[PDB]
């Protein structure tokens, strides 16, 4: 069953994130304390409320972006691909992720190709196939290694020209539902993805591109669950998600990490055992 998960890997925020974390725009100062509170609430939802077994990795001051675990690992069934981030400063993040996943007894595959780069944020897994964004963080060689690692799934690439990663404007919101931003760029990317697949996906358009990034889970005792941005952050988008009456909607804040280009999917890696 798509979206099913039993465990989730997360990582604590390092003090260095406030001023050293990578960001496309240097503007509003990050409130570290508040960022820690939002992370605590985020982890509380996944672990306490939804009952997932949480694996909490310690923060590393030398790795300002270590909180965004999604970018260093792509998991599909029992196999985990340890990526080679497009950002040199984030490559050491793979060390602790590899150890964590190996402890969970998952088939490990490392991206050692010195000419290949891939960020987990550029990978959209629909449960049926993979869509990989080609951006400044992920290249053709990286997409090729992904396709080789998960041979039982189709892999198609799509240009990411306006955002950091593919998931900066889309994510799965349900079994056959893709949440997508209303921007022309986001809509154009979705058209390309849909044209390459032989399966017709349903789409849920939201006014705020960054609000199109949500976390969908299928919990045995609750059913369809969706973590999305709060009404305070993006009221117009939260209102759209209200249409999903068969989903257990859970508002989750992430305003501080968004300052360093971090969205909801970025802070976790879901695994099903
Ligand atoms: Zn991300």
Q: How far is the CA of 182 from the centre of ligand 1 (A)?
A: 19
Task: Check the annotation: does 137 bind a ligand.
Answer: yes
Residue 40 CA to ligand 1 center (angstroms) comes to 18
Experimental method: X-ray
Asked whether 242 and 234 are in contact (CB, 8 A), the reply is: no
- CA of 65 relative to ligand 1 center, distance in Å: 10
- Minimal CA–CA distance to 133: which of 85, 82, 103, 167? 167
List, in order, residues 6 or more apart from 83 with CB less than 8 Å away.
Answer: 71, 72, 73, 74, 94, 111, 118, 119, 120, 142
The answer to whether the annotation marks 22 as part of a ligand binding site is yes
Distance separating alpha carbons of residues 42 and 20, to the nearest angstrom: 22
The hierarchical CATH code for the domain 1-273 is 3.75.10.10
Q: How many angstroms does the Cα of residue 164 sit away from the middle of ligand 1?
A: 8
The set of residues, in sequence order, having a beta carbon less than 8 Å from that of 133 and lying 6+ positions away, is 122, 123, 124, 157, 158, 159, 160, 165, 166, 167, 189
Q: Around Cβ 5, how many Cβ atoms within 10 Å?
A: 22
- Which tokens is 107 given? 């088939």
> Distance of CA 50 to CAs 239, 250, 272, Å?
23, 11, 14
Of 7, 39, 165, 224, catalytic? 165
Q: Is 65 annotated as a binding residue?
A: yes
Question: What are 207's two structure tokens?
Answer: 């006014």
49 CA to middle of ligand 1, Å?
A: 23
Which residues are CB-contacts of 28 (< 8 A; sequence separation ≥ 6)?
259
202 annotated as a binding-site residue:
no
Going by C-alpha positions, the residue among 73, 178, 81 that lies closest to residue 124 is 178
Resolution in A: 1.6
Query: Using an 8 Å Cβ cutoff, are 214 and 264 in contact?
Result: yes
Question: How many angstroms is it from 167 CA to the middle of ligand 1?
Answer: 7
Distance 221 CA to ligand 1 centre (A): 29
Secondary structure, 3-state, the chain: CCCECCEEEEECCCCCHHHHCCCCCCCCCCCHHHHHHHHHHHHHHHHHHCCCEEEEECCCCCCCCCCCHHHHEEEECCEEEECCCCCHHHCCHHHHHHHHHHHCCCEEEECCCCCCCCCHHHEEECCCEEEEEECCCCCHHHHHHHHHHCCCCEEEEEECCCCCCHHHCEEEEECCEEEEECCHHHHHHHHHHHHHCCCCCEEEEECCHHHHCCEEEEECCCEEEEEECCCCCCHHHHHHHCCCCCCEEEECCCHHHHCCCCCCHHHCEEECC
Q: For the chain, what are the domain ranges?
A: 1-273
Among the listed residues 66, 76, 214, 266, the single catalytic one is 266
Whole-angstrom distance, CA of residue 211 vs CA of residue 206: 7
Question: Is residue 161 classed exposed, middle or buried when 0-12, 13-18 and 19+ CB atoms within 10 A define those classes?
Answer: exposed
Strands laid side by side in the 170-174 sheet:
170-174, 177-181, 202-206
Dihedral (Cα; 111, 139, 194, 146), 10-degree rounding: -10
Tokens representing 162 are: 């306006």
Asked whether residue 260 is marked as a ligand-binding residue, the answer is yes
71 labeled part of a ligand binding site: yes
Q: How far is 15 from 217, CA to CA, in rounded Å?
A: 30
Q: Is 39 a catalytic residue?
A: no
165 as an active site residue: the answer is yes
211 C-alpha to center of ligand 1: Å? 13
Residue whose C-alpha is closest to residue 167's, from 212, 201, 203: 212
């Amino acid at each position: 069953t798509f979206g099913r998960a039993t465990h989730v890997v997360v990582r604590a925020l390092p003090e260095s994130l406030a001023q050293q974390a990578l960001r496309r725009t240097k503007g509003d100062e990050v409130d570290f304390a508040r960022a820690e509170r939002q992370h605590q609430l985020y982890v509380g939802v996944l672990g306490s409320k939804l009952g997932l077994q949480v694996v909490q990795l310690p923060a590393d001051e030398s790795l300002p972006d270590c909180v965004f675990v999604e970018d260093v690992a792509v998991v599909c069934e029992e196999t985990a691909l340890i990526t080679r981030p497009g950002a040199p400063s984030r490559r050491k993040e793979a060390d602790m992720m590899k150890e964590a996943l190996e402890k969970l007894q998952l088939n490990i595959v490392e991206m050692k190709d010195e000419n290949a780069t891939l960020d987990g944020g550029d990978v959209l897994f629909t449960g049926r196939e993979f869509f990989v964004g080609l951006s400044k963080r992920t290249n053709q060689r990286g997409a090729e290694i992904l396709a080789d690692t998960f041979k039982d799934y189709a892999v198609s690439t799509v240009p990411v020209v306006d955002a950091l990663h593919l998931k900066s404007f889309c994510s799965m919101a349900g079994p056959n539902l893709i949440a997508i931003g209303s921007s022309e760029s986001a809509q154009k990317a979705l058209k390309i993805m849909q044209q390459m697949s032989d399966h017709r996906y349903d789409k849920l358009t939201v006014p705020d591109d960054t609000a199109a990034n949500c976390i969908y889970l299928n919990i045995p005792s609750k059913g369809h669950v969706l973590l999305h941005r709060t009404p305070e952050e993006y009221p117009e988008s939260a209102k759209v998600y209200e249409k999903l009456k068969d989903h257990m909607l859970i508002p989750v804040s992430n305003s501080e990490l968004e300052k360093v280009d971090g969205l909801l999917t970025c802070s976790s890696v879901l695994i099903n055992k």
